[PDB]
Amino acid sequence: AARDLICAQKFNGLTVLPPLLTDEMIAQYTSALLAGTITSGWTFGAGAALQIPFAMQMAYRFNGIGVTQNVLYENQKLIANQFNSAIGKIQDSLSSTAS
Amino acid sequence: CGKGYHLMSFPQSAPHGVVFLHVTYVPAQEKNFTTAPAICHDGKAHFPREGVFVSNGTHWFVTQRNFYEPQIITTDNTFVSGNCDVVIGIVNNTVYDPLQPELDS
Ligand SMILES: *[C@@H]1O[C@H](CO)[C@@H](O)[C@H](O)[C@H]1NC(C)=O
Ligand SMILES: *[C@@H]1O[C@H](CO)[C@@H](O)[C@H](O)[C@H]1NC(C)=O
């Protein structure tokens, strides 16, 4: 067809170097961080990953913000439903809006 | 302020800069325990004030989160909220009352 912009860029001595980490390695680091913060909590950022059930981890998180930890233990299904609904709303907003 | 749980730091002078010595707290030797969110006793649910419920296989203890220091589950380190019919994963145990030997003596 026609001459591209990038061929005219490269023919005049202007190149683009690739990054050191490929996107697979970025996704691997992101998956490792997600698996650590789901399975262990904040213990993997200070040393060895210490396993804990996720309900008890979220009870610790509620205890950190000034709410007593039983409020999760009588509202666990509602809190899980609210988290799933918010994740679905994020997915819908990313699929709809592109700006 | 370093990696770990920060305790203290010490400045040192360097050419065109500064050097910090961050003293941190790192957990070392781990162990596996069986845990529960609450303890059912006399139709009531007991949650720990500070700490976590653990079990070595036969008995149930309560210990702090960052160090293994087990102790007996009493009414002075647990609080009561509701019954046992709502909390998922509640186990059965007994809760010691310190007033019972003092009343009997
Ligand atoms: C705990 O159990 C897991 C699974 O059986 C095992 O891999 C691990 O070595 C055990 N010990 C510690 C200290 O995590
Ligand atoms: C705990 O005790 C109650 C009554 O004492 C009983 O209904 C319940 O099944 C017990 N829990 C388990 C896990 O056996």
Q: What's the CA gap between A52 and A35, in Å, rounded?
A: 13
Q: Among candidates B30, B66, B68, B34, which has minimal Cα distance to A48?
A: B30
Rounded to the nearest whole angstrom, what is the distance from the C-alpha of residue B25 to the centroid of ligand 2? 41
Resolution of the entry in angstroms: 3.0
Interchain contact, A47 vs B26, CB within 8 Å:
yes
B20 by DSSP, 3-state: which? strand
Between the alpha carbon of residue A5 and those of residues A10, A12, A15, B58, the distances in Å are: 9, 11, 12, 74
Tally Cβ neighbours within 10 Å of residue A61: 14
Q: Which residues in chain B are closer than 8 Å to A50, comparing Cβ atoms?
A: 27, 30
Is the beta carbon of B29 within 6 A of some atom in ligand 1? Answer: no
Between the alpha carbon of residue B38 and those of residues B2, B30, B59, B76, the distances in Å are: 35, 23, 15, 15
Is the beta carbon of B32 within 6 A of some atom in ligand 1? Answer: yes
Spell out which chain A residues touch chain B, with contact meaning CB-CB distance below 8 angstroms. Answer: 43, 46-48, 50, 52-53, 55-56, 59-60, 68-70, 73-74, 76
Interchain contact, B27 vs A50, CB within 8 Å:
yes
Q: What's the CA gap between B47 and A73, in Å, rounded?
A: 10
Q: What's the CA gap between A8 and A5, in Å, rounded?
A: 5
- Pairing of the two strands B34-36 and B17-25: unpaired
